[PDB]
């Protein structure tokens, strides 16, 4: 029994227990990439994610006729790629690489960005649905003041209330407290073997197969079948550790930071090129982003897990996580996307890689792209990009 | 008359001086405040100016060493004036985390000019909960004490009371030019309007309260105009660059009607009575409505000009896109659709505060006055 196998299977599961749900009139929410999934889960609601969906197609090259589609209907192309792509579905009635049910609800948290918020907006308006709001306002103070938890937590029990109606079911206090303890350890599994890459060297997977798992935290969080996939993930990684194996094709000369979502249209593209200059991340700041980690049936430790994401703390904060995600990656480079699509990640990335570099003593370089428009990345310019940085880490590396 | 015209003209076209001229004159602090919302009643209350800050026609430089190229024109042009000290003689600016954009420029700004205290604000999307109001109290009596840390003094909760006063009945002074300025659309022209409007962010409101109100005298003096060209709603961020304004003029277009964040967004919703002065500011975030910047699942914004536009015989509804502002850009095609739908003609315009090659526009705007002409 393969790790990867099972994986797939559990996230095309979930699209299909979606479109059953559909079917046999049961509500299917959309939801942000980082909302409370435990609200939703203690109803035993069906749950897909817009920005998983998207980055999917995106793989599979079909996001570029949707992201068309929603520009044909007046949505700009400076407006992230994951919401056109996916107001594209919604106009084109779904899609066939990877399609998905439409949602009789909506769950949007913008712990991650705001632009979600916009985005769900409109999509509430289109099919004119239920929105949940759990809205994390921007943490600029280095905790989170007692004022956002209190309001976090009244959100939280106005999702609930919301989802009662929803679902038609009554919040059950005994079924909150086990899907807490299941996300809380489903969260743990993905910080420990998501983290093992800062070891091993080589890493027992290559940078990028993170992407892929991702999928998983993401999506089925409190979840008992995501626990037992990640046990048997790690019971591979560490196979791998303790005999010098992994998943990255040949010798791992360098290891690296990349900042930012990959390109998904040019994932592919991305692996390879990396591969043969003998390059891996092994430095990352994702294992961290669905840690949330909080005590069973504890609502103030819960609010504060989703606020203090990394998108939503001060810049200083946000700097940390990459500086030390160099560190203990033990990491020769740092290499930084410019995601034309989030401008919160892209508008403090300057700032950002400039303090990390001047803290790490590190070398750093850049290319432009975006994670699912196809339009804004240029092959030819990552390679000549990466190989300056090879170059940097070679020369510094021979002493 | 050029009476009026002429001071609101003089303070608008040097921000800058005026501030400095405040400051000699009463020896107190001039606080800046970004874009869309801010809490101007504390400011006010301080004794202090509450300064809006829109940006300008600039080119980009210094901001290049924080942002790329997507960011929007006005943020851009704040942050490159800030990097060149055109904001020094403020003794700190709000910078309110509305969106991603100033979400970051209020990040940057914390390291790229550390001489002007940045006090963050963060106005709740779920506006309408009560704890979404004792929230925003939270974060106004942050914004309090800051100030405070500012000018030294407290600030006296009678004050902000008083100040609530002040603001409320400038409000509905304005609301009052926007029917005036309506009943006179051949004499006001669109210039004119956004003058009018504009210098109330660089003035204690209680002196551009009497200003507005003298302009609205000499005008009921004058008989009732029907306009001879075209009228139109203009809805955005902000549309003041005098390029645009003449554009509208040469083509004989009468703006008597707004949903522009810089203008008639900034006083169409009172502040709510109560006894608890902090509570009442908050309050008025929660009525707020018809805003790109305001959570609304239902999106009224398209309706509500709607209702404007009929209850004035607008002829069309110009969109003064912001350059790269993806609030207003994810907003368009729905409160397009639903304008459209109601049987008004609309336009689309990029507004961008680094260009000084505007042409499109003009081109747009011609078409637009000959298309409503049938
Ligand atoms: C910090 C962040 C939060 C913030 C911010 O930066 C962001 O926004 S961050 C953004 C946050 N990002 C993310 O969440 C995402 C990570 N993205 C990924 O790459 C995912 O792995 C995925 C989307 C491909 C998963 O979805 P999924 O695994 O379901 O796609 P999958 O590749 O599995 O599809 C192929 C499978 O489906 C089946 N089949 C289909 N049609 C068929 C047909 N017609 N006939 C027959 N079969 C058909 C096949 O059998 C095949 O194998 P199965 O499965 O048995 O093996
Ligand atoms: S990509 Fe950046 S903007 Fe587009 S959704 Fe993920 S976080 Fe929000
Ligand atoms: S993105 Fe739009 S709303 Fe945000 S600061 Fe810019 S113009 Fe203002
Ligand atoms: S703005």
New interface residues.
Partial sequence: KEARVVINDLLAEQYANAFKAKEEGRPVGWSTSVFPQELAEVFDLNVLYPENQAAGVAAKKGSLELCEIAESKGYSIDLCAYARTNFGLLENGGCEALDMPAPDFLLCCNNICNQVIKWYENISRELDIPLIMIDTTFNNEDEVTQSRIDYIKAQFEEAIKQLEIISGKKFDPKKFEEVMKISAENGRLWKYSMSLPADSSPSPMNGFDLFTYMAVIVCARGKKETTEAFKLLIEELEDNMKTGKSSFRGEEKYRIMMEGIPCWPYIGYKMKTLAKFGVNMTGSVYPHAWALQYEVNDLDGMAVAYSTMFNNVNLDRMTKYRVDSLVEGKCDGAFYHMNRSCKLMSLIQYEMQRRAAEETGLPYAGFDGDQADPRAFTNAQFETRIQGLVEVMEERKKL | MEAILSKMKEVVENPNAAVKKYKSETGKKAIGCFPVYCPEEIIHAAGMLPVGIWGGQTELDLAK????A??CSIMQSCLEYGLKGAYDELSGVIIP?????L??????W???VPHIKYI?L?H???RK?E??V??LI??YK?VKRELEEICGYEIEEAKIHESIEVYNEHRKTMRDFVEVAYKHSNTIKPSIRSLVIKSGFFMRKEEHTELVKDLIAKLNAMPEEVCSGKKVLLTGILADSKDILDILEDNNISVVADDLAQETRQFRTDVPAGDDALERLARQWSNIEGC?LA?????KRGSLIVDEVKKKDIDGVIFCMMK?C??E??????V?KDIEDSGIPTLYVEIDQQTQNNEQARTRIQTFAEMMSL
């Fill in positions: 060493q924080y942002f790329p997507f960011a985390g509305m969106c991603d954009t979400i970051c420029l209020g990040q940057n914390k390291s790229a963050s963060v709740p999307q779920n909960l704890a979404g004792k929230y939270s974060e942050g790109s959570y609304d699942p239902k999106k790269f993806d609030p850009e994810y907003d368009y095609p729905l397009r």
